[model samples]
Target: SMEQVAMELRLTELTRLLRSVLDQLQDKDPARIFAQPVSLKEVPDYLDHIKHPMDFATMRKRLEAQGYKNLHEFEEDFDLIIDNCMKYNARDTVFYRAAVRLRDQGGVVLRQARREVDSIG
Candidate 1:
């Protein structure tokens, strides 16, 4: 079906863009702190303070599952990951600073990616 083909094409492009963003983000975080899920035992109050948790590992899982229906969804999760960090960590903390950096740098990258993908429409 034409619609199916259209969806597959979008998915292919979307996957490529998201994968690139993910890789870039991971590269920026050399400590690999944001690479995986935050440990509940390490911060038992994490769930209480942060209602939603997003990580690079989880993003990849969803990307693989094709859980992202569009560019907006991908962008949302990307921001969620960074925002969650900023929310949980104090502004003076390294984690908070990293999230802010990512938020700034990744913001431009995401918008650029969005434009590229949006052009497909």
Candidate 2:
């Protein structure tokens, strides 16, 4: 294959993997809180505690913009989204458990992508 074809294929693969990971997370969240940003109006103290907040909605936009250059860059956002939830919500809360669940499932998706796609190149 040509260099341009290789580049395009790699990016197309990355986008597909990223979207798969995102869709799984959204499906896992029955409450759908993880689907979008936690509004400051609902929780005024959220930003004060969690320094960096993330959500699937923003990630989708970033993906559309081709903001992430590689899987590792995308994983940073994934890690932050879960970590932020855990940091902001106490262990006794539903939100914390949701974060834990997403973290677990997200790990699996990421590992599959790395094994099947990331290592090939």
Candidate 3:
């Protein structure tokens, strides 16, 4: 069936996309813009804050203005920031929610890696 095959292909493509995104995230420096500890307990709250007054819209526009074209593109950039923040300070739940947020938004999440970038500055 074309639909079945297409579904499989989409899954494969998503897998590949997640892997590539995670690879880039792994290569980011931990001491960049996100050196503060994150709390998953605050994620829903944060999302609430961002979603209020349609804040995601403003953020989406900002990212688009900065050259990101869509949600997937924005997720990749956001993942790097999450990875860097998690690296410096450990917060499994927060990182998990970050991944989950991406997935909930149709973005793919991948395993973390040991690679690091020399500088994010």
Residue 100 displacement (Å), model 3: 23
Candidate whose TM-score is highest: 1
TM-score of 2: 0.85
Each model's lDDT comes to 0.82, 0.83, 0.41
- Model 2, 28-121: lDDT tens per residue? 7778778888899999988889888899899999987767778788889988989998888899999999999988877777788777664765
- State the lDDT of candidate 3 residue by residue for 1-78, as single tens digits: 999887666555544444455444433423222323334475545543332221233333444344443235545556
Tell me how many residue pairs clash in candidate 1.
Answer: 0
| TM agreement with the true structure for every prediction | 0.89, 0.85, 0.30
For model 1, which pairs clash?
Answer: none
lDDT for position 50 in model 1: 86
Each model's number of backbone clashes? 0, 0, 0
Regions of model 3 farther than 4 Å from truth: 31-37, 40-49, 52-121
lDDT, model 3, position 30? 31
The lDDT, on a scale of 0 to 1, for candidate 3 is 0.41
Q: Point out where model 1 deviates above 4 Å.
A: none
